[PDB]
Each structure stands twice: as structure tokens, then as C-alpha cells.
Design a protein around this motif. Sequence first.
Motif, PDB file in Angstrom:
ATOM      1  N   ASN C 127       0.753  -1.259   0.000  1.00 36.67           N
ATOM      2  CA  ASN C 127       0.000   0.000   0.000  1.00 36.67           C
ATOM      3  C   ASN C 127       0.789   1.318   0.000  1.00 36.67           C
ATOM      4  N   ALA C 217       1.648  -0.836   5.584  1.00 35.01           N
ATOM      5  CA  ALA C 217       0.245  -1.196   5.319  1.00 35.01           C
ATOM      6  C   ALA C 217      -0.793  -0.131   5.643  1.00 35.01           C
ATOM      7  N   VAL C 218      -0.691   0.538   6.810  1.00 36.35           N
ATOM      8  CA  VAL C 218      -1.739   1.467   7.257  1.00 36.35           C
ATOM      9  C   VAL C 218      -1.239   2.886   7.600  1.00 36.35           C
ATOM     10  N   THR C 220       1.414   3.409   9.779  1.00 42.49           N
ATOM     11  CA  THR C 220       2.106   3.330  11.080  1.00 42.49           C
ATOM     12  C   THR C 220       3.613   3.034  10.952  1.00 42.49           C
ATOM     13  N   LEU C 222       4.776  -0.001  10.701  1.00 43.67           N
ATOM     14  CA  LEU C 222       4.970  -1.364  11.228  1.00 43.67           C
ATOM     15  C   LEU C 222       5.651  -2.248  10.170  1.00 43.67           C
ATOM     16  N   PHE C 252      -0.399   9.063   7.763  1.00 41.51           N
ATOM     17  CA  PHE C 252      -1.774   8.564   7.624  1.00 41.51           C
ATOM     18  C   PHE C 252      -2.472   9.291   6.476  1.00 41.51           C
ATOM     19  N   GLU C 253      -2.363  10.631   6.430  1.00 40.96           N
ATOM     20  CA  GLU C 253      -2.912  11.450   5.345  1.00 40.96           C
ATOM     21  C   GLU C 253      -2.302  11.012   3.988  1.00 40.96           C
ATOM     22  N   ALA C 256      -4.223   7.441   3.311  1.00 38.82           N
ATOM     23  CA  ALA C 256      -5.689   7.507   3.370  1.00 38.82           C
ATOM     24  C   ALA C 256      -6.251   8.429   2.269  1.00 38.82           C
ATOM     25  N   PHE C 333     -11.013   5.051   5.367  1.00 39.80           N
ATOM     26  CA  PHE C 333     -10.156   4.765   6.512  1.00 39.80           C
ATOM     27  C   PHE C 333      -8.665   4.901   6.145  1.00 39.80           C
ATOM     28  N   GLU C 334      -7.867   3.827   6.261  1.00 43.85           N
ATOM     29  CA  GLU C 334      -6.413   3.868   6.080  1.00 43.85           C
ATOM     30  C   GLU C 334      -5.931   3.873   4.631  1.00 43.85           C
ATOM     31  N   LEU C 335      -6.827   3.750   3.638  1.00 42.90           N
ATOM     32  CA  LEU C 335      -6.343   3.709   2.257  1.00 42.90           C
ATOM     33  C   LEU C 335      -7.329   4.224   1.224  1.00 42.90           C
TER      34      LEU C 335
END
Lengths: 449, 445, 444, 440
Positions: C127, C217-218, C220, C222, C252-253, C256, C333-335
Amino acid sequence: NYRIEHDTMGEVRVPAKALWRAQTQRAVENFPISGRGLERTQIRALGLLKGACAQVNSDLGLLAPEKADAIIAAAAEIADGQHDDQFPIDVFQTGSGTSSNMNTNEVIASIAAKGGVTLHPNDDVNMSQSSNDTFPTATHIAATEAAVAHLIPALQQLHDALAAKALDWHTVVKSGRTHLMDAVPVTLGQEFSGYARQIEAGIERVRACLPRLGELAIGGTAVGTGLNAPDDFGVRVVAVLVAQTGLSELRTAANSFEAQAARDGLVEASGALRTIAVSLTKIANDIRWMGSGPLTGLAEIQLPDLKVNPVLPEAVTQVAAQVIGNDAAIAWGGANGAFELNVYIPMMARNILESFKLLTNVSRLFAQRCIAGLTANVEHLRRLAESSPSIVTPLNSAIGYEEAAAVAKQALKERKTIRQTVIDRGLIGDRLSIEDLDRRLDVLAMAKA
Amino acid sequence: NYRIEHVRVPAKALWRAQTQRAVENFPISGRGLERTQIRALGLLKGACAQVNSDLGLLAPEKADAIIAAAAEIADGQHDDQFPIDVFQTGSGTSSNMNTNEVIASIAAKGGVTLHPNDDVNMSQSSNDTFPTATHIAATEAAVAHLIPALQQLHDALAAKALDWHTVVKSGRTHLMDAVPVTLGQEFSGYARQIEAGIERVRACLPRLGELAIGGTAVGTGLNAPDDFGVRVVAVLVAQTGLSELRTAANSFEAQAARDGLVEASGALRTIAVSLTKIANDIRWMGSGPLTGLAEIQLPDLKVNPVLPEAVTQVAAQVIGNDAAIAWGGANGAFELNVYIPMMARNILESFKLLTNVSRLFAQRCIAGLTANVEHLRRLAESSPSIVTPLNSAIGYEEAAAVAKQALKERKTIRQTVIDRGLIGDRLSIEDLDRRLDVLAMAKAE
Amino acid sequence: NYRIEHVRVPAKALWRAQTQRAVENFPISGRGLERTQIRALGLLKGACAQVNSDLGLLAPEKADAIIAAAAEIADGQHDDQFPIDVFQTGSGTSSNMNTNEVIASIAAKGGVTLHPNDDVNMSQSSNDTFPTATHIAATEAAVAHLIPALQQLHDALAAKALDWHTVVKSGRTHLMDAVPVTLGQEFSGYARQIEAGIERVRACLPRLGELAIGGTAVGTGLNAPDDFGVRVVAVLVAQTGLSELRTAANSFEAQAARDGLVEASGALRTIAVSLTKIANDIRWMGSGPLTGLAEIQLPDLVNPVLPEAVTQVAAQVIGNDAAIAWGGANGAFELNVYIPMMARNILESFKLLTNVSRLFAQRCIAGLTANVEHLRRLAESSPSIVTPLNSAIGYEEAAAVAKQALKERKTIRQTVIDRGLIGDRLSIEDLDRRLDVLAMAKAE
Amino acid sequence: NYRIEVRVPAKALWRAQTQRAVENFPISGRGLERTQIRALGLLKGACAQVNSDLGLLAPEKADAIIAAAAEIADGQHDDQFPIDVFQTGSGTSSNMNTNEVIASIAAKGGVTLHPNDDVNMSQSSNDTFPTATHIAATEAAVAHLIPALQQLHDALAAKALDWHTVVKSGRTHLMDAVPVTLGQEFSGYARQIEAGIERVRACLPRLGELAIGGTAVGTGLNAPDDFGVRVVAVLVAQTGLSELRTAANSFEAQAARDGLVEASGALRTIAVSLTKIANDIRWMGSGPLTGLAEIQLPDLKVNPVLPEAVTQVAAQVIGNDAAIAWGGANGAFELNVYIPMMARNILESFKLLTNVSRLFAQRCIAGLTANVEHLRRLAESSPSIVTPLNSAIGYEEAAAVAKQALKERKTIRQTVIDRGLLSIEDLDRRLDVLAMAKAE
């Protein structure tokens, strides 16, 4: 100046003349976004719907005659445009249009109270109805009426003015223009027959969307299932609306779920309005260019004076830009429904009904105050066509392509007609007579009128 | 009831014959100029009279009467004296004449005779006035109202990002279960979108604030003093405090095009796009409770997400208005773009809707949101997405078996590892809790 | 002709099973990624391998093989190895996997075994890679190609503004006769529109250059090193010279939403709006000659074919802009899952505006010729220029001069003489000073 | 490697005018699509047939054009059309491209054709490319889009039938609502696609109008008087497309492209319908843990990749629609010069909607599975269904039942029993969620 209304939360102030109650006033204060509420056509349609629902509830023995008569009388006043100042809620409200629905129920209850009849806005005025199938129904009633009773006659008036000009200017020969460059002859009448066809095709486009624009969600209740409504409520309400308005285009939705989960009929109708806006842009642009100058422009025609600026073509092209913009807002709202309900109805209603209104009013103005009074500069138009290098081709079989190109070059340089240049070059003789020359250079015959 | 002019004009109307003729010529929308446009026309006329007085071109008694009447118009005292349809002559000359006529009638009530064209329109033309008032109104709408409204929305979203910093939940990609995030991190994303929105508005101000005043009929400045534009702009800046107001870099571009409005609309359209994402996520987070996501609770004004609905409808309107503005913007011809009243209507409406809905959304939705903290943590701790850090202890096959059993028995990953008898020499309870620490997986700062 | 995988893949293809499954899953447009997008994916993969090597996470032999393979992709040597449709999984994961598989096959030819996911996609996710390559490609398209193409167009319009500084003509407002202007002044207006266009592109670069790389992935980060993003961006900026490339302000922006593409499209759409006005005026100026304005002559390549190419390109940019904003608003949301469609449209708008601006400047603007005498004659014959006669003969006689000039198709000067107005009240020198149309245009 | 005429590639069937157009427009690097090339081949073959029938073109020359045009229509020369889409707005360059390619095909068979005098006989530079555009758009609508949409309608209607009794809770404003069935929702989606087909069919009387015979300005000068009707007759007989017509007005048919703007509106409405259908389906399949988990999408958990392809296609159709309308409005006098750009966008919208609708129907809709027990459990646990209990226990007690059911995560039926509350048969009749959905 003001009066106090009460609900379970407390008190609110309303204008003294207001017929709405506390719930409408709560909605007014919850949505101070645009400061613009429902238009007269949306208000009328809500009145027509409430009267038809009361009639059906009375017919089915579900509502007492005194209560039904009071709603029918109150709703008739609303449909007659007597309470256009009683709908203060912003267009940008809860996406189902439930606030405007409650606003209608409250105004009807207050009108009936003045006549000594007590109505419960929800239990009586909203009987057999929900918060979700009422506002989209009133929207499609208003859009269908706007299309049939107002837009189609306005477009027909514009088509007739353009067709009358096509007939009057049938032999008004001029030079054609392709890529904005000199082309073979046409008539001003032929160009206006093209504009007339664009408006005629515009009417066909509006008529083609009516089987789906006229579909009403009434009777589907909260989610489209018809729960808490009589099984035949929808067909009965539609029958009453058709008999009262004369709008035979009004019908029950083919699918009660599609009629509430989506507003695809408004998206479809907007597409027809957007195509008309596209046609009007071409017609208005050509007319203001035809009237341009006089010295620095084309000076083909003279527009009626209302420096004669083409103010009606400017009003038409600005209206077209607004219709294009409103069309993008409608499609945006249309696509973003979720499950059992599309919640963009008040925004979609505002834009579609505005597009109908602007096209109706500007088409009538354009037809009456611009098209009807246009005058052509006949001699100037014929002179330019007869002076064009584009018309030297029928001389080739008499003088040859080399001499025909020399005639074209000299005509432009000396600012003379092709006929005068052929005479000045001493080409009139045994190989080409004056009668043969006039037949070959007949610009009206070239336009094939 | 009415008076006769050299047409019938209503008795209480301050407009004269040219306005009445425009009323009769354009019955199209039934809607005239908004308050912000009327105010800008009043501001412009007062500044022009001040400069014409300063240059000794207009008598002091006449200049004082225009300045006093224009101040009343700018103060919103005559918003019912502008009946001309938005869909009028494309230069906005009708509304320009409407302002000159209203000023003449106000001064007449005070015993001063003004010629609407010769005095109120002195050193001006029919073509450089309405676009100037439009850019004054758009610049004021951006600086004095939209940016503070967006800042209030940013501050409410940032306060939520801080309050919900450790509110761990499961992420969602393609609408499917993903690795953990915090509700605070998502709200920091929304806050950044609004902060970027403010940057976008600020970036368009050097061109939005450009005024055509002084360019007269075709941009050449013929029939105006050579320094009229710089002087009028200096008076407008001193009186309004709007330092973004400036003379146009090129006087021909400032009248032949309205590209500054097209540019500003692009920034408003991007904000509408950002607001759509923020509002959609919030109404989905508050959905249900039983059939939805039930992550948060929206304040009640069945709790419907009425403000996210107002926000997404406003965003659709801004998108639509943006397409109308660009359409008008592209279709100028030679020395004048004649789509100004339509472009003005749409840009000023987009500023107004975004301003008012952003403030309502910040105060009456965002500020009062409450999170279902325990529900959010339990779902994150029950997700098959968090079994990956167990692989180096129990292997990917046993971790997949744990994920499968957790879903079937509706248990946390931690409880499933315990229930399968995996706690021993190969994996202690402390090692399990460190590996399955969902807040640490979100990596919050 | 083909080879079997654990799926039938063409023999000369460097992609593997996941790409072939994506080819079979999305036969929608028949159009894959463009050269600029393929290039950016190659640039990203090489920078990621460099950083993974620097952090001791990837063996040097494996890193060197990825860096060598990725440089071939960035150099445009494998543009026929990306067959996946634009209309694919909205994260662009299929095209990310396509790049990893092609790199693995290139390395295998050199005897190095690479795992497409474990090695080529190390510290990355499905992502944060395709949106990074998209913003690299868009930033490069803006800085290296569009801004120089617009500067060339501005320079051609400004050269015409200078050459035609004294070419007086009649102005036009509402398409009607107006007071004098110069062709030079009109072209200075067009030059300003393009100069403002460059300012608009430059103003969007602080947000267009933001890269999501490192957010995984989101958003973060991670399963990535904490400084992966800043290190990858440091390598990309040092190697390409594109200083506009930066880590996202908010991770995040950056995943998302794709608001930077929506913003950049707005600038391209404004340029399309400016180009429409410039091209329309130029084809109208060159119209006729007999039935038109006949102000200028366009170079023959006489139809205004380049103004037509410009106005059609502008229509395409407007259309692509609506598609980009549509995709931009519909993240969840996240994507945001509209990235390949948004990438297609934004990169096409950059390309069309770049190529048509260069063509328009070189093959249309540079060779324009003005009909100087015709332009001056019309300005000198205009009723609009009788106003400076008012203080000598009065506005009534001035209006009579204007009426007679139009009727007899004569200049205002000739009409004043023919009406016998030359005398004690108005000399021939005073008349020529009052009717000086170039002075009326007030050129700088 | 190249021949001199201008340097033209040796294997190229195009000539000098096409090569000059390649050099003049390096803008997008993309030329005409296969459908456009096919339509130009169909038009040239029909024109040669009519010119032969009227005794204006020699049989050997006519046969050579008809054979060469048939090869082009059959997709045998799709690599012989290199001119950019962004060319002269009339599409004259692509018209000349077709004439030159036909001349070179006929030359290989020993027949000399003049590209203008023979292949463009009775035609002009302005009535040919819009004719080929409307042939291609009409074929795309009738032969490909309508059957693809019918396939999607049939898959959605089969799901509406299969899931007729699959009761679930309705959602309005994304909040809990009274019961519906999954079958009823899918009947709604099926109607949207059925209405989509009606929308395409309604635009065909104007989409099928051809400008052929109008020549340079719409007057028909330098063409036989019945050229248009004869060419259209040949095209209808050969393609089977009865929707192809002569234009009602020859001036409107060249001065405007309003039929493409109208058709794009229908495609845009379908894109709007597909967005709603695809969004609901990916939300229904969301999670499983963090989402709605109503259905399971077939794997190609599982990402909704086909709903994502559908919503991206819809965004492209919306964008293309705005480009078409923009071009459509900006015609001038006798000719609208935005035809190649409008043709590109309308034909792309037809293609994308055709291909994604078939994929969506076969590889997503057909294989959907419902979580029947989960859907019924949520409907039976909803506070929305306590209203039919009011006449037995009262509004106060019915609200207490709703509150306790949500807190204990139990059905309304179980909560009524647990509160010691009306017979068991009367309770099951009152709380019959399938009956509440009122399925036909």
C-alpha cells in the motif's frame, strides 16, 4: 414581531407570521449553511403530495373526513403558492429531506388550526408515510412538472422562433466557415435550421427521460418495503396526483428499492439538461459572433437592443455554464447512496430544479427578445460569398485551374467579386459568356437551398 | 406605490431606470447578488471617490456624499436595493450601474445631487469595476472567514487526535481487517488534510487578491489617472486591513481572464474532496450500532449523522460550482471575459458553504464525538492480522490455527494461545503479551 | 511460446505468476502503466534496496542485483514487461508485485536468486509503494518536463509581446468594437497567463512531492525501520536531483488520501483554462481571411490546427481533472483505493500539456505574422476614437463624424477633413495628436 | 528501412499526408482504437459500393477499395493508423490515413487508386470522420455494451431470486433500520442496470445519425443528392445495425456532436448506478471482524478487487463525460472541431463499461455467498422490530426490551422470554422479521 413555540427541550422564537412550529425552528438553527431554502416548485410538490396522501387515507377509511378535508384544503393552499415563505429550512439539511417533510406537516397543522381543526403533524399529516419516501416523491413530482409544463413549451417557443428565421432567411446566401476559415456557400436559413434541429432534439431528449423521471417512491416507507403503509398506497396516491395535476408521466416506481436507494432518474434528466446547455452554447456563440463588430467583427446580423452588446447570448452561455456545474453536483450526489437510502436528495433537488428553471426562463427570453428581432445584412453576406476564392472551382472547366487560381488571388488583392475579376481579366469571350459565368458563379445554387 | 423615470420603479427602491430595465431584461433565476458582493461594490465605490477627491477630480461635497453612501452599502444597510439577476450582461456592468444609481439616491436624500456615471463611476469603466468587487469579495471570504473556519475545524480534529492518542483499534484497507492503528492517528490524518487545505487557500492569495481597477474598458487605463489603480488599492488595504489586495501584475490578463477565480475554486474543490473523506469515515465510524461499525457515537442535534450528510452535500455543491467556474473561465474573448457574474456567484457560494459547514462540523459534531474504547481494543486484540509476531515462537502454521480458532470461538488472539496450551518453555505469558501488544504495533509517538 | 508456473506465462516475459493472474483478472482497458510510472517504480525499488543494504537488512549480492535491475527499469529498458491494466486493485499492489517479479527475473539471468516479496519488497508493503512511485512520477513530470515546456511557451508569447509592442489595433469587449490596444499588449496578457500557470505548478510542489514510503500497510510504519522513509527519500533526492521529493508531513494522510494529486490537477486544469483562451483568440485572430477577423497569419503545417490540438488537449485535461477529484474524495479509513486511475489521469494531463505547449510555442506562436496596416486602418476608422475630438468640435459633431465614417467606410481623420472641420478651432497637427491611436493604447 | 515520397517506414501502408500528420502532432503517442479503424473501413467500403452503383467509379477501382476496406474493417491493418488522437479537429488526417492505406493495399493487388479522387470520391474532409465516429459508437452501444449490461442484469436478478428469503436489517443514513431481504436489495441493483439499458436504447435514434453526404459544410455540394441515404442503406444491410440513420438535419450533424454528448450522459448515469452497486457490495463483504461481514466475495481476507475496478472505471467514465461535453459545446458555425477528442472519450467509456460489467457479473456477482444465519440474527436482535410488541406489553416495556437486548447482545425474542413476558406463538408472529420485509 416574534412569538414563542415550545417542545420537550424548551422554547424557540419564530417570526409572528410563521406557520411552522418548534421542530422546523430547531432545524433552521441546526443548519445555518447557505441561508437558501426550498424553491416554489419543491414547496408546491410537497403540498400536492400531502393532499393526495390525505385523500387516499380518507378513501381507505384510515383518516376521519373532517381531518382529511382540513389537510386537503391546507395542502391546496401550499400547492397554489400561498405559503412560499413558510419553508425556512436550509437546502443543506438531513440528506433524506425529512426536515422539509416535517416542515410541510407542521405548516398544514397550523393552517387547519386557524380553521378550528386539530391535526397531529406526524399521526395525521404524515399518516401511511415515512421520513424517507416523501421528499424524493415531491422532488420527482416537481422535476416532472418542470419538464412537461414549463421546459418543453419554453424549448418549443425557442424552436419555433429559430425555424421561423430558417424560413425567412432561406435564400440569404453567405459564406460557410469551417475551422473559422472561408468555406463554400451556405444560407443563414440553413444554419438556423441546424439550431432549430438542436432545440427539437433537446425536446426529444427531455421526453426520452420522462418514463424514469416520473417514477415516485411514495408507499415504499422507511426502506422501500412498504411496511406501515397500505399495500396499494403508492398506486392510489399516484392515481390522485395524475387526476389532479393532469401529469400522466407520474407513475409508481418499477422497483421500490431502486426508487429510494438511488436518484438515478434525476442524474438521467440532468444529462438531458446538460446536452441542451451544450446545444444552447453553440447557438448563442454563433449568434453573438454573427452580430460581432460591426467594424472589427463579422457584422453578419444585428441583434435587438435591450455599442449593442449581445447580452442575451451572454445570459444563455452563463446559464449553460451553471447547468453544467449543477449537472456535476447531481451526478456526485447520485453515485453516493448507501444501502436503502440515497442521502443527497435536497442538494440534488436544488440543482435539478434550478437547471429546469434557468433553461426554461432563458430559452423564452432568448426566443422573444433576441431571435425574433434579428436582422440580416443581406447585401454584405452575398458580397462576401461572391468574393470568395472557394467559388472559383466551377470556372476550371472553362478557364483552367491556373487561371482560376489567378482570379482568386487578384479578387482578394483588389477586394472585388470573382465575377468582376473574371470580367476585369478579359476572360469574357467565345470560351465563356456572361450568362455561363453567372450560372457557374451562382452562390445560392452552390448552397443547394 | 411607484414612480416614473426617463419605466415604473417601486417607491421605496433606491435604484433608478438602468437597474429597472435590467430587472425587466433578465427574469432568469429570481436571485440577485449576495451580501458579500454588495459589500465589495460599496467598498470599491467609496475607495474610488476617495482617490478622485485626493487627485482633485471630484468636488469634496460630492466625494463625501459618495463615501458616506458607499459606507452604508458596505455595512449591509441596502442589501434589498440590488434586484438584478445574477444572469445579466457578462461584464457585470448592470450591477455596477445598480451601485452607482443606489449611491446617487442615498446622497439625494441628504440634498446632494450626484450623476451616477459622471460622479459615482468617475475614472472607472463598465468592465474593470465588477471583476474588482468580485476579487475583493473572494479575497475577504478566503482571509476573514474561510481560513479561520478551517483553523477551527483543524483545532477540533487535532484535539481529538491528542485525546484518542492511545485509543487502539484495527486498521482498515480496501474495507478489510488490517494491522492496528489508533483513533488518534486517523484524526491526525484528518487534521493534516484541513491544515493542507489552509495552505492551499494561502497559496492562491497572491493571484486571487489581484484587482483590475484602473484598467478601464480594455485594460489600457484610458480615461483614468495613470496611478488610479495603485491609489484605489492603497485606500482599500488601509480601510479593510486586507493586505492581500493588490494591483494586477498585468492589466490585460486581469480583464481578459478570471484565472484567479478558477485557481481559488481548485483549492476549494480540494478541500471539498478532503471533507468528503473525513465526513464519510466519521459517519461510517458512528454507523449502526448493531448493523454497523459502532466505533464512535456522534452528538445528537436513531442518531443520524446529519452533519456529515450536510458536509458531503456541501462538498458535492462545491464540486459542481467548480465545474461552472472553470467553464466560464475558459470562455473569455479578446479584452474581456464575460462570465463574471456567474463565476462570482459560484466562487462566493463555495467560500460561504465551506466556511459555515466547517464551523458547524467542528463545533456540533467533532468536539462531542465519544469513542467506544473497550470495543475498539477488543476487536484489535481479536484480529488474525496480529498473529504475525507469534511466527518466530510457534511457527506460521500454529499461528494460522490460532487465527482460525479465535474467529470461530469469537475470542482474543491472547485467549486462543492460552486455550491451545501454548504457554510454556517455548513461549512465556510475558513474551506473549509483548508480541501481542496492539498499541505498540500501532507505533504511536 | 509459454512457460508453466505454480499459470501459463509468455516465454520472453520477465513477470511471474502474480502478474499473469493480474493480466487474466483485469482485461478492462487493454492499457497498462506508462513509461514515467514504470520509471518511478524502478527508481523506488533501487532506493529501497540501497537503504535495506545500508541498514544491514539485505545481503550485498542481493542488494547489488536489485539496484542493477531497478536501474534498467528506470532507464526504460523493460517498458514491455508491465502488462497489468490501469484498472486493477485500487492500491496498485498488482503493479508493485509486477516490478518485484520483473526485478527477480532480471537478477536470475545474472545468477542471483531474489525472492520478489522477501527481498525486492523488503521493508515495504502492498500500500505505500504504488502511491510513492505515483508522486515521484508526477513530481518529475511537473519539474523536469511541464515547467520547462510552459517556460518555452511564455518566452515565445513574451517575444511576440515585444515584437508587436507598437502594432495598434482595435480592442474587442463582448465581441464588439472597443478603444485601441496593441497586439503586443494582448500577447503580454497571454504571457502573464502562462507565467501564472508556472507559479500555480510551483505552488503545489510542497504537497505533490510528499512520499508515503515507510508508512507500510496502514501508515504506522509497522515492519519497516523507523527511519526507512527519510533514508529512501535521501537516496532518491541525491540520485535524481529532484529536491521537491520529501517524506509526507503526516503518514496517515499520505495513504488515506491522494489530495496532492487533486491539488496538482487543479493547477493543470487552470493552465488548460488559460490555454483555451489563448488558443481561441489566436484562431479567431487568424480567421477568414475574407469572412473572418484576418488580424494575423498562422504558419502552415490555412486551418488553425495547433490551436485545435491545444483546445482538445485542454478539454482532455478538464475531463481527467473530474476523474482525479472523484477518485480523491472516495478513500476509506487507512487507504484511498483509486490510485492507478488517479495516476493514469494526472500523468496523462502532465504529458499532454507538456507536449502541446512546446508544439504550440515552436510551430505556431514563433511564426505568427501580423497584418499591421489592416489592424491600424480599422483602429483609425473606429467610432470609439472620436471622444478626444469633443473638446474641439463638441460631442454632437463628434457623433456625426463617427456616423459618416462608418457609412462611407473611411478613417475618422478623413471624415473630419471631408466635413471641413480643419480651421482655426482645429489644425491638422492638433487632429493627428487627438486621433493618435497608438498613444490611446498607452503602451509602456 | 525507409522510402522517400518525407521519409516513410518501408513496411507502412500510409503515405506522405499521414507521415506529415505523425510529424505535426507528437502529443499523446496514442492513435485511433480498433473500433474507430474498423468504422473508417466500413465507411470507405460503403462509399465505394455507392459510387460504383451510381456509375461514378470504375468497377476494377470499386472492387479494389471494397476488398481493401473489408481488410481494414476485419482488423487486419490496425498498425497502419499512427496519427495522434490530438490532430486537426475535423478528423481529416485520420480520413486521409484511411484513403492512403486503401490505395497502398490496392497497389499490392496491381490496382492504382488516387486516395482523394477515388477513395474519397463524393466525400469531404469534414463529413467522413464524424460518420465513422457515430458508426463506431452505435456498434459499441448495440453489439457490445447492451449485451454486457444484460449479462450483469441477469446475474443480479438471479441473486435477487436466490436470496428472496435472506432476511437482514435495512440501513438508512448507515443506521439500523426495519428488515429487508438481500434479494430485495439485489432486485434494486438489477433495476438500476435494466434502467441503464433503457437509457442506452433511448439515445440510439440520435446516436445512430450519420453526417455522410453533407460534404464540406452540410449542403451536400460535390456529392450525389442521394449519396447519404444510399451509403446508410449499404451500412445497415452489411452491419445489421438498423440504428444507423441519415441525419435529420445535415447542418446540425456537422456543426455539432450533440448525439455523443447525449450518449455520454447515459454512460455517466450507468457509472453512477455501478458506483452505488459496487460500494454496497464491497461494504457487504467488508471485514470480516471489523466490517459488516454480510457476504463473501469470490477470491481472484479477500479484497474487493472487482468493485474497486468498477468504481475506478466509473470515475474514468465521469471524467470522459466532462471532456465530451466540453468539446461538444465549442463548435463554430459549420463545423465542430473536437471530434477526435470526443470520439476517443465516448468509445473508451463504452469499452470500459462493457468489459468491467461482464467481469463484475461473472467473477464477482455470480459467486457471492451470503452469511444467512448472521444476517437473520442481527435482524432478530434489532430494536427496530420491538414496535409490533406495543399492543401486547406497551411502549415503555418494549423500549426496556430493546435496551436489554442491545446490552446483553441477545435477540428481541430471547429478551422478551428472559424478562418473563402474550403467548410464544403470538410473540413469533409479532417478531417475524421475514414477514416485516414483506417479500413478494
